[PDB]
Amino acid sequence: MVTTFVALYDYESRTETDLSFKKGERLQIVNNTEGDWWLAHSLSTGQTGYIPSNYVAPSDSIQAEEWYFGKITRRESERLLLNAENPRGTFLVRESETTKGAYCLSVSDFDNAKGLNVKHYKIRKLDSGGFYITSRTQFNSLQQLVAYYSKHADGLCHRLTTVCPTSKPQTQGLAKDAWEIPRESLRLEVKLGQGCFGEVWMGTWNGTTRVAIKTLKPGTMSPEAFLQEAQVMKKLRHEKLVQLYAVVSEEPIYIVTEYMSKGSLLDFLKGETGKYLRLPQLVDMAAQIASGMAYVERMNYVHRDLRAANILVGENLVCKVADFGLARLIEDNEYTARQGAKFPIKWTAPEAALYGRFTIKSDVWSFGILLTELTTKGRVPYPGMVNREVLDQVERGYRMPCPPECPESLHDLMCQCWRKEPEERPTFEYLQAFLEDYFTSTEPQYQPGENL
Ligand SMILES: CN1CCN(Cc2ccc(C(=O)Nc3cccc(Nc4nccc(-c5cccnc5)n4)c3)cc2)CC1
């Protein structure tokens, strides 16, 4: 059907105007003139958006079939079919190397004594239009031949089970949306920092707006992985979260956000202003962070990297949640976490660190640890304890004690955040209200000392 295409691979949406689809999905594309990105409309979901043109095939063509591998050699088909995880009966169809115009069905098999091997069955074509492996069983299409042998082996080594898996190709360039800006609209002014994955600058946007510009060093993480952070920030908008302004999706990749003039909360606490802060100021900062996290909570997201180093500060003790580089929408299943997500370990709840169960409740644990950073003015959690020993201690019941000059009621709040069972930890909704009302509802007799 001309203008109908079939997806060869899965594609996940990563902008506001691209289209998610699954392999085998049928899509209308009425202008396939060119570019590497085509406007498509799904005949399954009725959704419209842009798709990578190398991920689809015309619906008429044999190339639309997932099991059709075209012109590959006998030996290359074997290499693909002998993948360690393929079930017995994994298969593909390809051109025959030995008979012009014929095809070949190649199938993974298993010898109980000798192990994995591949069998090949030549598919010949008649003048009548038929296809066959054996003369007695003919079909009008490769599709019907495959369908039949997926029901019964009928002479083959095994019934056809699984279509041979293969590598998904990269898209040609990244999908872009209305957050994209021309790089000429930016001037880099002051370099704020740098690390293994790039740099952060203070700059100006459109000649008028002060911004922070996070840059990706090429050859480190993928542009897609880097921009996951911007994808999250397009959806999460709140006064106590750092705001996304724009992206530049060609190398070097930029993420452009609002600029927070005082830098990280950790450095702010350790610096000269920390000496002049007392409990009311620190609790107010905690409440602001809790308000941001209560929004993240309501929106069904998880941050996964909450700590004072990832809060940013402005004038007048304004605090905002930042660094959404690990943040995720919560899904009702498990996933294999990256080895790096659990670090730094002193902020990570045991069930997140041990089993990869990162939830809003593991963010609550991290918030409790953040409360210790506030009340000690930036001391490292678990002082005297090396990173390698922390998990075992916490698992066995060890909790940090009440910091000097910290009211017992605030340490009791920290301890609730560190409950062994995640469900027994408070919500950020509760934490925000508690901290906002602290000096009227909880400590109405408070008087400052020299530190808190
Ligand atoms: C161990 N690790 C090694 C690599 N290193 C890189 C680094 C170091 C310092 C800063 C900093 O002081 N930033 C700073 C200073 C003054 C103001 C701001 N303001 C600001 N405003 C908005 C966004 C951002 C920002 C910061 C970091 C990442 N992305 C956005 N920063 C930032 C930023 C990045 C971090 C530590």
Domain boundaries, the chain: 1-64, 65-166, 178-263, 264-442
Q: How many angstroms separate the alpha carbon of residue 312 from the centre of ligand 1? A: 9
- Would you give the DSSP letter of residue 361? H
CB 187 within 8 A of CB 240: no
* Ligand 1 proximity of 215 Cβ (cutoff 6 Å): no
CA max distance for the chain: 98
Record the tokens describing residue 145, joined without a space: 């031949």
Residue-wise DSSP of 20-47: -B-TT-EEE-S--SSSSEEEEEETTT--
CATH class of the 1-64 domain in this structure: mainly beta
Tell whether 198 is in a known binding site: yes
Q: Which two tokens stand for residue 287?
A: 């409440």
Whether the Cβ atoms of residue 419 and residue 374 lie closer than 8 Å to each other? no
Strand partners, 384: none
Residue 427: CB atoms within 10 A of its CB come to 16
CATH 3.30.505.10 applies to domain 65-166: yes
Report which secondary-structure segment, H or E, holds 388.
helix 387-395
Q: Ligand 1: distance of its center to the CA of 371 in Å?
A: 21
Of 148, 146, 149, 144, give the one whose Cα is nearest residue 129. Answer: 144
Consult the annotation and say whether 200 binds a ligand: yes
Superfamily of 178-263 according to CATH: Phosphorylase Kinase; domain 1 (3.30.200.20)
Distance CA(287)–CA(269), nearest Å, equals 16
DSSP 8-state class, residue 425: S
Choosing from 305, 332, 392, 437, the catalytic residue is 305
Q: The sheet that has 26-28: what strands, in order across it?
A: 48-52, 37-42, 26-28, 4-7, 56-58
Ligand 1 pocket: which of 264, 313, 321 to mutate (most atoms within 8 A of CB): 264
**How is residue 59 written in tokens?**
């619906």
5 is in an annotated binding site: no
Long-range contacts of 140-144 (CB under 8 A, 24+ apart): 142/62, 142/65, 142/68, 142/93, 142/103, 143/65
Q: Is 390 marked within a binding site?
A: no
CA–centroid distance, 259 to ligand 1, in Å, is 10
Nearest CA among 198, 205, 193 for reference residue 229? 198
Counting ligand 1 atoms within 8 A of each CB, the residue from 192, 232, 268, 310 with the most, and so the one to mutate, is 192
Helix, strand, coil in percent for the chain, rounding step 5: 30, 25, 45
User: 192 labelled as ligand-binding?
Assistant: yes
Catalytic residue flag (residue 154): no
Tokens representing 389 are 């020993």
Report the amino acid identity of residue 261. Answer: S
**Closest ligand 1 atom number to CA of residue 261:** 17
- The reply to whether ligand 1 has any atom less than 6 angstroms from the CB of 214 is yes
Q: 263 C-alpha to center of ligand 1: Å?
A: 7
Tokens of 431: 């934490």
Measured by CA distance, the residue closest to atom 4 of ligand 1 is 195
Ranges of beta strands (E only) in 217-366 are 244-248, 254-258, 263-264, 301-302, 311-313, 319-321, 328-329
> If you take atom 10 of ligand 1, which residue's CA is the nearest one?
193
Whole-angstrom distance, CA of residue 240 vs CA of residue 426: 20
Phi, psi of 297 (to 5 degrees): -60, -50
Q: For the domain bounded by 264-442, which CATH number is listed?
A: 1.10.510.10
Ligand 1: residue whose CA is nearest its atom 8: 193
Please answer whether residues 198 and 62 qualify as being in contact, where contact means their C-beta atoms are separated by less than 8 angstroms.
no
Is there a contact between 353 and 300 (Cβ–Cβ < 8 Å)? no
